[PDB]
Major capsid protein (Human alphaherpesvirus 3), 98 residues
Amino acid sequence: SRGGVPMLHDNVTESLRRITASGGRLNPTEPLPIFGGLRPATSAGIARG
Amino acid sequence: TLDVQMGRFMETWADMMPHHPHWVNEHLTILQFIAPSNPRLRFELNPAF
């Protein structure tokens, strides 16, 4: 969720949630549109935590 | 022969490669090829083939 400012380095911290989100279940996205309430994809139903 | 297509060898190893390394993975301790959700595993397979 949003509020920030633009743009003179991107695609390698693009190596940073395409190279960041580590160590557990499920991990994120590539292309970056804007400004919403944001209902997306499929995840999981219940066994421990 | 071995002087020309040679070492000018990398150049035409740039019709080619700076995207760094995928099953390149060979150095740490037990976990970034035993945790849950990843691009490069559908390959390193069988006791056949």
Remarks:
- The longest helix of chain B spans residues 4-7.
- The CA atoms of residues 7 and 37 of chain B lie 40 Å apart.
- DSSP finds two helices and no strands in chain B.
- Chain B touches chain A through four residues (CB under 8 Å).
